[PDB]
Design a protein around this ligand. Structure first.
Ligand code: CAC
Ligand code: CAC
Ligand code: ZN
Ligand code: ZN
Ligand code: ZN
Ligand code: ZN
Lengths: 313, 311
């Protein structure tokens, strides 16, 4: 009712504060970080870079991030816990499945996947006792039969535990509509779902209609455009349509990445030196200078994630 | 000296060695994330220890676990079951058929570094070093599979550690593998072409053997006619290529990389497990006139010569 699971344990809704709802410490693959830490220089080097990054973000106001790295994205909650403590920033961990499931996941039934998700939420991830506070799902534009199983399992897990669902989409294909239909067929409330990567489109009609059904709209990759201004104005556009309370904002940034061709991390960093501090240091002043009240911005960056993450129903 | 999950052993300690086996056929990260799939980690461990003791009591002294990173290799489990069962286990590097994005997008130079790491330094943070390099291909060999082939050759050439392959024998896939590996300067004597018992094309096997490749007749119980597959062993013996033969079960004690409950299907079909080769195939070969010295050469001498790091 009033508590969410983080990598350091349970915390009250009040303690969450300014929350970036879609971020990554490391974008990788299952087992990869521990098998090949050298790829990131070293595990310590990666940990240190994250801590410095998170500390700057904290200096700029951020108090909580939701790491939406799944099993198949190389989620290492021990790394999350280590960097969360050193930086003193809350990190919410995720279960669910992204776009790279191995055979041992691809060949599972919806009932089996439901059990895996429940495990990571109710018991803990691996042997850590760290519990997931959100369920991530990724689909291609047209939802594949396996991705539909993952969607349904996520809905059933969410209905059993109250933790929310966040999605990866192709907004240019308007992927969120196919997902929503499947999720609702399972009896899941739109208020428990964030349709992610929605800032990668100019289709306001698509965005508003989803918001009007109660869905959280993930405008979560603003600096990837580094234009980034156009993405930010979608936040304004949705406010002006009256859907302030359905907006979630993030950077979708990373401190390490192996699930892409080599050297991309340095290109990203030089493209966006602010890292996860891009939202508080760049997007928020931009929105102020456009006439959005400070109180509406606080509602979006604090109150909305609070409402979204609190286990419900 | 051969690297095992318990440390280095001399080639004489190896003894009766099964050169293609698995403790568990899974996926990277899977065993630690979802141990309940196998009942529990403890349940999986205990089954494997019983099975390895069964094989030990049948003469086996060493198995080669050719589970790679993407087959969900957990060398801490291997070390645990090896100690409990007093059976040597050789661990593998390389890549099987389910590489994740973080592997699929790597260059050959990068893959070479990863394989070298697991051979020279250790696997994960355990200090356990790989003693063999596994590689799997399909069809005519995909572009990425070529990269793994070449990275494996380069790792082998720098360390002396052998290369063992997964192949579609029905497609004569060993020929393309051989071509690529030889282009890298790798000697065929450092290479086992595996799953070669899944064909009837004897001339395919003979031609590879004649070039110096080890022939992995490693899936005999996966037929159980297994008697027909066993006759391939005698066929190569009769052609004077006893030196080129490796035999194994390719068995597992837990499987997650397939449909649920496939493990139970497999166990009821082959209740002997990894003891299938010594309890069924070896006596069957004696009946057909194969002398004990020849059988000892296949099960002891050949794997020792294969696994011993050689330049
Ligand atoms: C690293 As992503 C696919 O969540 O933008
Ligand atoms: C794990 As297999 C069937 O390729 O030996
Ligand atoms: Zn995404
Ligand atoms: Zn992301
Ligand atoms: Zn194989
Ligand atoms: Zn195998």
């Amino acid at each position: 009712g009033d508590r969410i699971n983080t990598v350091r344990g349970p915390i009250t809704i009040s303690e969450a504060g300014f929350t970036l709802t879609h971020e990554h410490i490391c974008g990788s693959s299952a087992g990869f970080l521990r098998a090949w830490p050298e790829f990131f220089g070293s595990r310590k080097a990666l940990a240190e870079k994250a801590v410095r990054g998170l500390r700057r973000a904290r200096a700029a106001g951020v108090r909580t991030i939701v790491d939406v790295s799944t099993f198949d994205l190389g989620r290492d909650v021990s790394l999350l816990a280590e960097v969360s403590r050193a930086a003193d920033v809350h990190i919410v961990a995720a279960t669910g499945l992204w776009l790279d499931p191995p055979l041992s996941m691809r060949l599972r039934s919806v009932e089996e996947l439901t059990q895996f998700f429940l495990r990571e939420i109710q018991y803990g991830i691996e042997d850590t006792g760290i519990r997931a506070g959100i369920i991530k799902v990724a689909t291609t534009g047209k939802v594949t039969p396996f991705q539909e199983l993952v969607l349904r399992a996520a809905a059933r897990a969410s209905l059993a535990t109250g933790v929310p669902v966040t999605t990866h989409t192709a907004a240019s294909q308007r992927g969120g509509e196919q997902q929503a239909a499947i999720l609702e067929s399972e009896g899941l409330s739109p208020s428990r779902v964030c349709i992610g990567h929605s800032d990668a489109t100019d289709d306001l009609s698509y965005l508003t209609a989803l918001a009007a059904r109660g869905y959280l709209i993930g405008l979560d990759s603003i600096p990837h455009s580094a234009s980034w201004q156009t993405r930010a104005l979608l936040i304004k556009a949705l406010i002006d349509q009256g859907y302030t309370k359905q907006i979630l904002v993030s950077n979708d940034w990373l401190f390490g990445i192996s699930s892409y061709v080599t050297n991309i991390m340095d290109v990203m960093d030089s493209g966006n030196p602010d890292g996860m501090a891009f939202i508080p240091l760049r997007v928020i002043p931009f929105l102020r200078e456009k006439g959005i009240p400070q109180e509406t911005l606080a509602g979006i960056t604090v109150t909305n994630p609070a409402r979204f993450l609190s286990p419900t129903l």
